[PDB]
Design a protein around this ligand. Structure first.
Ligand SMILES: [Zn+2]
Length: 395
């Protein structure tokens, strides 16, 4: 254990692509726990073994089996579980939870630089590229029954996609992060390279639908939980008694169409701009007849901002001001707002996506924009352009 004082936790990032930085191989990759680079190991002549002699760095983590090794001794560090430093590092690579930990989530935590964060309510690097994916991962990680299943189970038997996704969800909730933000560049890049994710354009709705469908085709357990918790159903219906066509359509996400909008009208006050209350968008179902015949525990709405089959879809998007508060009722079933994905503008204008999430325990809204988090007031959330919302059914 003499070498454990050489470990430098601040250099360790386990969100990176798991490849050897010398051979670019993904096979048998180790992380050097002194400098944090990855090396294929661990036999003589391997990059990790050579690194250990030439750079004088001797403590490694096998990134696949999570066992610790001394090199060039080439011996496993046993009882790594009794060693605080080692527990800490193994937890950074693969957070573990028991049911009672979840009872005190979320809570204020501190990263290694003593920056405080509320666990589960953290941001992500490279929002310029992956903001649409950050919002979707946060949404699904904050649906308690889905989150709990990912945090408390292991997924070595359900294929590479489900294992990688489970690890993202486990890190999103980690109360012991070394730094208070995550990278999911490699996860999203893996989806494009190996799981055929190739939508262009893409946005939080298209990616949420893709990700729910991919989860369902990959895991029978998660399929049954998403089907039960998230999947709604709409029924559309119209001397000789005709019964008339009845379609029952399941949905993950219910699209609410906004009133016709002209991008060329300008004004200098909010009362000059079009507005509509969310309850009025739902009139369709609460007044051919449309009915929500299955109301899920989590009801996800999409506000149809974009006409993608016309020129400059972002610039010409429907900017009707959608008004909502934190509660809603649909034919006597009450819901409370839990998540709000907002569209921000930064050839066409470019979309940027930010995610606001509700914490029941402290009763605060936290807005996650890139790695920044800011509290927001509930009554003013609707002033930004809402795109997707998650509502949770109340007893
Ligand atoms: Zn090193």
């Amino acid at each position: 254990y003499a070498y454990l004082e050489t470990v430098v936790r601040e250099k360790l990032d386990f969100d990176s692509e798991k490849i050897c930085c010398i051979t670019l191989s993904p096979l048998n990759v180790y992380c050097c726990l002194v400098c944090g680079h990855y090396y294929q190991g661990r036999h003589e002549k391997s990059p990790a073994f050579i690194h250990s002699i030439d750079e004088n760095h001797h403590v490694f983590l096998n990134l696949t089996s999570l066992k610790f090794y001394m090199l060039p001794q080439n011996v496993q560090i046993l009882h790594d579980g009794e060693v605080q430093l080692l527990n800490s590092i193994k937890f950074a690579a693969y957070p573990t939870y028991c049911p009672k930990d979840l009872e005190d989530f979320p809570r204020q935590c501190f990263d290694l630089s003593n920056r405080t964060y509320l666990n589960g309510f953290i941001g992500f690097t490279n929002a310029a590229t992956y903001d649409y994916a950050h919002s979707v991962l946060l949404l699904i990680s904050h649906m308690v029954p889905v989150r709990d299943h990912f945090l408390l189970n292991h997924f070595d038997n359900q294929g590479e996609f489900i294992k990688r996704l489970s690890i993202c969800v486990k890190k999103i909730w980690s109360p012991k992060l070394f730094k208070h933000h995550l990278s999911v560049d490699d996860f999203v890049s893996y989806l494009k390279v190996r799981e055929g994710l190739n939508l262009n354009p893409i946005d939080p709705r298209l990616f949420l639908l893709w990700l729910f469908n991919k989860i369902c085709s990959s895991s029978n357990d998660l399929k049954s939980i998403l089907n039960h918790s998230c999947k709604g159903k709409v029924k559309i219906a119209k001397s000789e008694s005709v019964t008339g066509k009845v379609i029952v359509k399941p949905f993950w996400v219910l699209t609410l169409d906004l009133p016709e909008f002209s991008p060329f009208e300008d004004g200098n006050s909010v009362d000059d701009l079009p507005q509509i209350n969310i309850t009025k968008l739902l009139t369709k179902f609460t007044k051919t007849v449309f009915e929500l015949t299955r109301l899920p525990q989590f009801l996800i709405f999409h506000f149809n901002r974009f006409d993608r089959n016309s020129d400059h879809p972002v610039k010409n998007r429907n900017q009707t001001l959608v008004e909502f508060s934190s509660e809603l009722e649909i034919l006597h079933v009450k819901y409370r707002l839990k998540a709000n994905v907002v569209h921000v503008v930064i050839g066409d204008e470019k979309s940027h996506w930010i995610t606001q999430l509700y914490d029941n325990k402290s009763e605060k809204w936290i807005e996650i924009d890139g790695i920044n988090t800011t509290e927001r007031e509930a009554e003013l959330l609707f002033l930004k352009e809402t795109f997707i919302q998650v509502w949770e059914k109340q007893e």
